[model samples]
Target chain A: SGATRIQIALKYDEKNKQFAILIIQLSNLSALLQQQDQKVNIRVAVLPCSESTTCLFRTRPLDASDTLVFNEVFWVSMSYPALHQKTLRVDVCTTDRSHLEECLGGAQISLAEVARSGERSTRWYNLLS
Target chain B: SGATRIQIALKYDEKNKQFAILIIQLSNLSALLQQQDQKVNIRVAVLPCSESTTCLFRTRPLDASDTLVFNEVFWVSMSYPALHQKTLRVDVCTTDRSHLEECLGGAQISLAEVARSGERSTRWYNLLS
Candidate 1:
């Protein structure tokens, strides 16, 4: 729980036809590592809901802006029926020159909860290991 | 459970200093999607075992060959104590030209299980959605 430093904002883009997660902000609240010095990688996926449908793998490096934008597109024709019940899973990790990765923490939020709140809705989640 | 068709082989590379997963072969066993025609994407990670260390995100497309190899490199200095207990999670998905991704299935294999078998050991696993 001490490793929880990153916060995320989520929203669905109808025009772009994608689900987006914005890395609104992050802090080195923990005494262990410095957030600015360490490189972070974020991964997003739509976990198994009612169907075996898989969302595209989306990732971004958190070394630049506090707001890192990443999203996954949906199929144009077939309806993604499983989207309603699926949980959005976000994973955070660190990387070095050798490209070796170190896991930092993660968080999951229900898409249904966000939708029920209304369109253009947004929620913030804290990252946990 | 019917969408199963991909098989994976796992091994730790000492020289290259990484854990590798080989996409040995795939078949259209489900009769729903053709193996050769379908574009497959593979994702690998070291799940939480004891630490909040993240491994680099590794992925590859399985369209060209029967054998698709992907791996994650570990830090050179610090000892990865969690490596033994960590379950190597492999996720298989599909993508189109539009970049829409569809999940196929996934499988988890324990790194300790592989080590117990001895060095240079390899094992095959079935992917489940």
Candidate 2:
């Protein structure tokens, strides 16, 4: 039970139609690499049995602003994206394993979570910019 | 326990700073086909959630490298990256149960997972990468 700890919280931005993850802190290091040439991994999913809803894990520069975002259009369509039946959890990891207590602070938001929160719904989200 | 199962593991190499995974005869098939032409899904997340971290699932020829490898710098700054959580699991599936399992197999590396953790996070983690 002594592994890295990442605190996750979700919020919806009605105006932007974007979901963001404000990563708080994992371990204790704020993006410091103890292992040589090590990189970071970040992942988000729809939970349980929804492969269609699950987003692949990704990594970003540790020095970038500590927020992970997803769009309503990107995750789903017509209505808020459905969850996988059970509670869905965001997963994070550091492949290096070199640094045990490093901290990476961040959070993730889902566009669907916003639309269903009673926020006005619109079909104005897409990847084409 | 009557569903398809995928066995996962890690192998590190000092050269090319790469690591490969021999997906090795999984689910009793050189390759398992199911449901529909659904875009077969693929995933690779680091263990323990180490953000510095691990390889992100990439879209490639399925089963190319049952042996998924890590390039010393690609996944790391130099030699090889590390791991988090458990033994690092490979999550795969199909989108439209409109189709069942259209595995997008093909392995991925930390290059995408580490560098594009944000902005391009869920951009299919594809296209522009």
Candidate 3:
């Protein structure tokens, strides 16, 4: 039940015909890691399936406050049929030891949910390892 | 050095602002494998870095002809700034042993090269295993 948290915003771009994920924050490790005695790494992966492809693979910097902030946006170039056929997966990991990468947790977004909500969708996902 | 060969067509979609890869064919194994189906599982992966992320993970069905036909079109939804920032890599592989997956070969396409060539680009890429 103890899970990390991430704030994510998803929207379908009509013009670009792509989907964008606005990674807001990883609230827990944002502070927990800073609160830790040993140093840890932080980053995120946006994927279709746990086994399929991932995008960007950018390293989100750290946070010293109550959460980790990554006001960054990544895009997936796909149409509604392409983007919505399946839900998107978001995973967060840290390689604090510098040798092994540990899965912090992840979140999920359903285009169906977003469409039901009328276009723009933003939700805080509790990270699940 | 024997190499695998693949046919790829890259085009920037103005309406969708997405990049689409029209995978035309993989000539050799199309026949070579069917010519021998000790049962090799064939598939392809598209990624940015050898160490980076790979998306889709779709399995391409086999070919008994002179080439493997995968008139499959995959869409990458990113802007010119995002899409062109890096050249895309396409890798193909097969696993007959079921335990060890052997790399058949791959190809590279530069958005820069495409833009310089002026719009719609179709190339037959030699597989580099």
Ranking by lDDT: 3, 1, 2
**Candidate 3 lDDT, tens digit per residue, A1-68?**
12355677788777767677788776655422433533333454433332444554554545244456
Instruction: Tell me the alpha-carbon RMSD of every candidate.
Output: 14.0, 16.3, 16.5
lDDT of each model, Cα atoms only? 0.49, 0.34, 0.53
- Across B11-71, the per-residue lDDT of candidate 3 in tens digits comes to 8776776667787776655523433543333344433332333445554545244556778
lDDT of 3: 0.53
Cα-based RMSD of candidate 2 = 16.3
Q: Provide fnat values for all models in the order shown.
A: 0.00, 0.02, 0.00
**Candidate 1: CAPRI quality band:** incorrect
Candidate 1: residue B10 Cα off by (Å): 43
In model 3, where do residues sit more than 4 Å from their true spots? A30-56, A63-65, A116-118, B1-129
Q: Judged by lDDT against the true structure, how good is candidate 2? A: 0.34
lDDT of 1 by residue, B13-104 (tens): 45544555555554443433455566767666655534444563445555634444444323321133334435556666777788776766
Off by over 4 Å in 1: A1-5, A13-18, A29-36, A49-56, A64-80, A116-118, B1-129
Which residue runs of candidate 2 sit more than 4 Å off their true CA positions?
A1-129, B1-3, B7-9, B15-18, B28-34, B48-54, B61-87, B97-129
Least accurate stretch of 10 residues (summed lDDT) in model 1 chain B? B72-81
